Design a protein around this ligand. Structure first.
Ligand code: T44
Ligand code: T44
Lengths: 116, 115, 116, 115
């Protein structure tokens, strides 16, 4: 589990359940190639996106579909998504947790990076 | 204005208007002595709390009554307030802006400290 | 485990290890009475502060000693501490996770509240 | 000024000065068309990006080059940038301030949307 995503709702104080998460990797030609995707569980976590073999060094993009989340709660939010773009594994393999904290007009994202 | 308070609402994307702010200074006996207070304006800002002459080095607390704000909006909040406690003018006099970003179950606070 | 505290360093992208956490409960006479204390583990978590029996409804204060943390890293931070003050268990027992995200001149705190 | 960008540094407690900001509008083919850009001022603010006449409804991206900022300071950052993507003027024309608070491993962004 080299890559995990954790998402929290700052309005309700609760994990964010069934939120779509897409991950992309920058290709040689500088386009984004689909890398992996999934939905958060009831703990607001998404595990198992990738493997140590698959998760090589590169620039990755994680886009969390915060708009669908807010809309399903009856709220028209400001952002289309929360996005995190980062260089991974450039000094060797690491483990990455991407945490996002969501409000209708604000979000924050944090990375927790550990050495396996 | 040595000390500036700016508050925003992360749910509505708006400044937080008319929220109470109390400033305390730590007294010798280690209790909080009320120092200054007011209400945020329509721009979410509270100016004129203190003066250069009055705002000496020491430890200060800024308490924002976030719970009354969420209560006015009909949204159940987690915190009783947001309080920011800091040592002032350690390296000399500066202009301080205490910014706070509010959500019902979360807040963040940031100090912007300039010349 | 009705009360857990989790603390992250936003400069280093890492859990915050050995940070002191004090919890107080407001007494009938409106003073703060020491309730519990501990230090974060290497996962930046502090478990076992209290029990369901002990953790009755009241107004609680969690103060995290962020100043000592930053100072031990050679940084002179803005805040004396990060504090969270909240009413607990007023609609029945809940489980509370208090997460704090720390930078030298900023912090955020979030509560995740679940129904056991 | 329909669109305002303000950036702060949570490590130093300061506005972030001279960081590059690029604004894009989503084109019909769904690629990002560069729209406006500049550098934040000494107050960390970028004004004058667009005008009322030019800033029509649509989907916009604001990209803040946070990685060059941390690089100038000698601090290893996590993100390549901070990017904020939003639908504009859904309910009509408004004044938008995109605020961002930066740390090496974390950022937050907030929209303040007024009359
Ligand atoms: N894991 C805990 C809850 C929890 C863990 C983390 I790690 C976390 O991380 C952040 C990220 C950002 I971005 C913030 O602004 C803040 I404050 C905390 C948050 I939130 C909540 C549990 O449910 O048991
Ligand atoms: N003057 C304008 C814009 C403004 C917003 C913030 I907000 C701010 O400070 C913060 C603090 C935190 I804490 C954040 O997470 C973020 I994102 C921005 C400052 I200086 C300026 C207004 O507020 O209308």
């Amino acid at each position: 589990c080299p890559l995990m995503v954790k998402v929290l709702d700052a309005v309700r104080g609760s994990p964010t359940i069934n939120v779509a998460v897409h991950v992309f990797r920058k290709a040689a030609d500088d386009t984004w190639e689909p890398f992996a995707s999934g939905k958060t569980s009831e703990s607001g976590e998404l595990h198992g996106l990738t493997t140590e073999e698959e998760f090589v060094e590169g620039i990755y993009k994680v886009e969390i579909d915060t708009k669908s989340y807010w809309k399903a709660l009856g709220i028209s939010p400001f952002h289309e998504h929360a996005e995190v773009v980062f260089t991974a594994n450039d000094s060797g393999p690491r483990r990455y947790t991407i945490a996002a904290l969501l409000s209708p007009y604000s979000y924050s994202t944090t990375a927790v990076v550990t050495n396996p």
